[PDB]
Amino acid sequence: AWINEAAFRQEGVAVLLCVVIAAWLDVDAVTRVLLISSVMLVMIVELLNSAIEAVVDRIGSEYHELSGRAKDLGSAAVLIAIIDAVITWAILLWSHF
Amino acid sequence: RQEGVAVLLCVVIAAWLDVDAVTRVLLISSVMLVMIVELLNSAIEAVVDRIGSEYHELSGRAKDLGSAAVLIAIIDAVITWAILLWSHFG
Amino acid sequence: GFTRIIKAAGYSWKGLRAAWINEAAFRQEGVAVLLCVVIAAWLDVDAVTRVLLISSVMLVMIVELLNSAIEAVVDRIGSEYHELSGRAKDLGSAAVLIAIIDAVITWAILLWSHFG
Ligand SMILES: CCCCCCC/C=C/CCCCCC(=O)OC[C@@H](O)CO
Ligand SMILES: CCCCCCC/C=C\CCCCCC(=O)OC[C@@H](O)CO
Ligand SMILES: CCCCCCC/C=C\CCCCCC(=O)OC[C@@H](O)CO
Ligand SMILES: CCCCCCC/C=C\CCCCCC(=O)OC[C@@H](O)CO
Ligand SMILES: CCCCCCC/C=C\CCCCCC(=O)OC[C@@H](O)CO
Ligand SMILES: CCCCCCC/C=C\CCCCCC(=O)OC[C@@H](O)CO
Ligand SMILES: CCCCCCC/C=C\CCCCCC(=O)OC[C@@H](O)CO
Ligand SMILES: CCCCCCC/C=C\CCCCCC(=O)OC[C@@H](O)CO
Fold first, then answer.
1. Which of B48, B67, B69, B51 has the alpha carbon at shortest distance from B59?
2. Nearest CA among B71, B83, B81, B72 for reference residue B10
3. Quick one: which of A29, A35, C14, C97 could link to A72 by a disulfide (CB 3.0–4.6 Å)?
4. Residue A93 Cβ contacting ligand 3 at under 6 Å
5. How far is the C-alpha of B70 from the C-alpha of B76, rounded, in Å?
6. Residues of A numbered 25-54 whose beta carbons fall under 8 angstroms of chain B's beta carbons: which are they?
7. In this structure, is the dihedral angle defined by the CA atoms of residues A57, A61, A67 and A72, taken in order, positive or negative?
8. What span, in angstroms and rounded, lies between the C-alpha atoms of A69 and C17?
9. CB-CB under 8 Å, B75 with A55
C-alpha cells in the first residue's frame, strides 16, 4: 500500500516513462545503460529517503532537531540524484536530438 | 557473507570478458551499487529493530521501502549486464 | 503537484547547508566533488566517460548524505550506546567508503586510458 500513495505514482511513472523512452531511443549500449541507470538511481534514492522518513515518524510526533535533519539530508540526497539524472540525460542526449 | 564471493565472481567475469574500459566499469559499478543499497538497507533495518521489537505500521514500512530499493538496484544491475553483454556479443 | 517540488527543494537546501556548516570533513569532501565535476566537464573525453566521471563522485555525495541521515536518526533515538546503534553506523560507513573507492578507481581508470 506504500506503492498506492499519489506521490510514488507520480515519481514512479516519471521514472518508468524514462526507462521506456530510453529503451526505444537509438543509442548505443553504454548510453542506453547510463540513461536507464540515472533514472533508476533516483527511484532507488527516493525509496531510501522514504524509508528513513518512516523510521523518524516511527519514533513519534514530538519534533526533535535531529529528526528534521535526517529528512533534510535524505531530501538532499534525492536532489543530488535528480541533478545527476538531468546532467546525464543532457550530456548524452545533447547533439542527439 | 555470500555477497562478497558473488561480487568477486562478478568482478572475475568482468575482468575475464574482453571488454573495453568503459564497459568494464559499468558492469562492476552496477554490482557495487547493489552492495551499497543493501548495506544502507541493512543499516535502516538495524535502527528499526533497536527502537522496538514490537510491530508498528511505520517499522514494517521502512523495511519494505528499503527492500524495494535493493530490488530496483538488482533490476538495474541485470538490465545493465543484459544490455552490455548483448552488445558485446552482438 | 507543482508545490510538492518547492517543499521538497527547500528541505534539500537545509540538508546541504546543515551538512556543510557542521563538518569540515564534509566541506572538504564537497570541494573535492565540485572540483571533480569541474575537471570532467572541461576534459577532452566522450560523453560516456564524462558522465561516468561525474556520476561516480555524485554517488559519493549521495551515499554520504544518506548515511548522514541514518546517523542523525541513530543519534536522535538516544545518547545511549547500542550494538544495533554501532551496527547501523558501521553499515552506513561501509557504504560511504565503497562509493569513494569506486570513484577513485573509476577516475583512475578513465584518466589512464585517456592519457596513457
Ligand atoms: C526477470 C528478468 C528480467 C530481466 C531480463 C528480461 C527483461 C530485460 C531485458 C534487458 C533490459 C531491456 C531494456 C533494454 C532495451 O530495451 O534495449 C535493448 C537493446 O539495448 C539491446 O542491445
Ligand atoms: C535534454 C535532457 C533531458 C533530461 C530529462 C529529465 C528527466 C530525466 C531523469 C529525471 C527523473 C526524475 C523522476 C523522479 C522525480 O522527479 O520524482 C521525485 C520528485 O517528484 C520529488 O518531489
Ligand atoms: C508530450 C509528450 C512527451 C513525451 C516524452 C518525450 C518524448 C521523447 C522522445 C520521443 C521519440 C522517441 C524516440 C524514437 C527514436 O529515436 O527511434 C529509435 C530508432 O530505433 C528508430 O529506428
Ligand atoms: C534538461 C532541462 C533542464 C535544464 C537544462 C540545463 C542543463 C544544464 C547542464 C547540461 C549540459 C548541457 C550541454 C551538454 C553538451 O553536450 O555540451 C555541448 C557539447 O556536446 C558540444 O558538442
Ligand atoms: C554472466 C554471469 C554474471 C551475472 C551477473 C549479474 C549481476 C546480478 C546481480 C548482482 C548482485 C550480486 C548480489 C546478489 C544478492 O545480493 O542476492 C543474494 C540473495 O538474493 C540470496 O538470498
Ligand atoms: C546547471 C544547473 C544544474 C543542472 C541540472 C539542474 C537540475 C534541475 C532540476 C532539479 C531540481 C528538482 C527539485 C526536486 C527536489 O526538490 O528533490 C526532492 C527531494 O529534495 C525530496 O524528495
Ligand atoms: C552538480 C551539483 C554539484 C553537487 C556536488 C555536491 C555538493 C556538496 C555541497 C554543496 C552544498 C552547497 C551549500 C553551501 C552552504 O551551505 O553555504 C551556506 C553557508 O555556508 C553560508 O555561510
Ligand atoms: C555551486 C553548485 C554548482 C552546480 C553546477 C551544476 C553543474 C552543471 C553542469 C556540469 C557540467 C557538465 C557539462 C559538460 C559539457 O557540456 O561539456 C561537454 C563538451 O565539452 C563535449 O564536447
1. B48
2. B81
3. C14
4. no
5. 10
6. 28-30, 32-34, 36-37, 40-41, 43-44, 47-48, 50-52, 54
7. positive
8. 10
9. no
User: In residues, how long is chain C?
Assistant: 116
Residue A56 identity: V
How many A-C residue pairs are in contact by the CB < 8 A criterion?
114
Cβ of A61 less than 6 Å from ligand 4: no
Q: What are chain C's domains?
A: 1-116 (1.10.287.3610)
Please report the resolution in angstroms.
Answer: 2.8
Chain C residues with CB-CB distance to A91 below 8 A: 47, 50-51, 54
How far does chain A reach from its first CA to its final CA, in angstroms? 39
Q: Output the CA–CA distances (angstroms, integers) from residue B14 to B77, B84, C57, C96, in the order listed.
A: 13, 11, 22, 23
Contacts of C67 in chain B (CB under 8 A): 40, 43
Check: CB of residue B43 under 8 Å from CB of residue C88: yes
Total count of residues recorded for chain A: 97
Q: How was this structure determined?
A: X-ray
Residues 6+ positions from C71 with CB-CB distance below 8 Å: C89, C92
- Listing DSSP states for B16-61 in one string gives HS---HHHHHHHHHHHHHHHHHHHHHHHHHHHHHHH-SS--HHHHH
User: How many other C-beta atoms lie within 10 A of the C-beta of residue C111?
Assistant: 15
List the grid coordinates of B28: 562492476
Q: How many CB atoms lie within 10 A of CB B12?
A: 11
Write down the residue that cell numbers 550494538 correspond to: C83
**Cell 540524484 belongs to which residue?**
A81
Grid cell for residue C41: 566537464
Residues A70 and C73: beta-carbon distance below 8 Å:
yes
